[PDB]
Ligand binder design. Sequence first.
Ligand SMILES: COC[C@]1(OC)CC[C@H]2[C@@H]3CCC4=CC(=O)CCC4=C3[C@@H](c3ccc(/C=N/O)cc3)C[C@@]21C
Length: 250
Amino acid sequence: LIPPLINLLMSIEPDVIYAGHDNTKPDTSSSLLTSLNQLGERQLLSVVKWSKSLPGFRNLHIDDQITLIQYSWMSLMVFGLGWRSYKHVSGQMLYFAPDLILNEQRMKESSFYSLCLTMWQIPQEFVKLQVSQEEFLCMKVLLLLNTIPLEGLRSQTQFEEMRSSYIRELIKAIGLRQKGVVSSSQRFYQLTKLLDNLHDLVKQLHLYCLNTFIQSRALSVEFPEMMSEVIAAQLPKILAGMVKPLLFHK
Ligand SMILES: COC[C@]1(OC)CC[C@H]2[C@@H]3CCC4=CC(=O)CCC4=C3[C@@H](c3ccc(/C=N/O)cc3)C[C@@]21C
């Protein structure tokens, strides 16, 4: 059977979110970026709601909660994207939403082809490692907890306890399918290494995002209120390396 905390995590996963994109009109650079931002605003709102039901999280100081959402949002959404593309279209298309799915041909014509390719690494890797939903749900929580300020958080003790709690839960998640100490131990390394590597992938998306933000009026891309808030609140500090990424390995 499934360990209780893992079962809870599945019950609090967000519902399907639509882009609201008008697919009865040809893709333009403007229209895609507008749709992706509208969709992202909605996904981040659902991440915030999610976090209010995530055990441990509401007991961190409110300022730590805000900071962790502001540090981790891009990671959470690209990781979510990865999981949907894996589960719904065998990882061979980018499943942003049910009404916004890019096959490779549509990616090629997007104007951010290589960004699509960067993002496409995750679901291909999911296919490769055959990640289970139980492993995914634990890893996703660890991403939320994967960077802290250089001075630490106000609720550092509680945070350490929460992060350790979810690391122990991933170790239980691995034990469900994988049998053998050797196999389980190596799988713990693989999954935690994947999380480590996401720091580098996310940095590329952060730089693309901030560049597009700066040039938004010339490019005619709308940046929503919360999106603009999180960008202005932490993105340059993050890109500058003025935060502490938490690595599982050397
Ligand atoms: C071409 O991309 C434009 C982006 O750069 C503009 C660069 C990376 C995009 C995010 C990639 C992950 C992602 C997954 C989704 O399923 C939908 C949203 C999404 C991205 C987009 C995004 C928009 C808004 C928000 C939060 N708003 O509150 C989050 C993500 C756009 C960027 C950042």
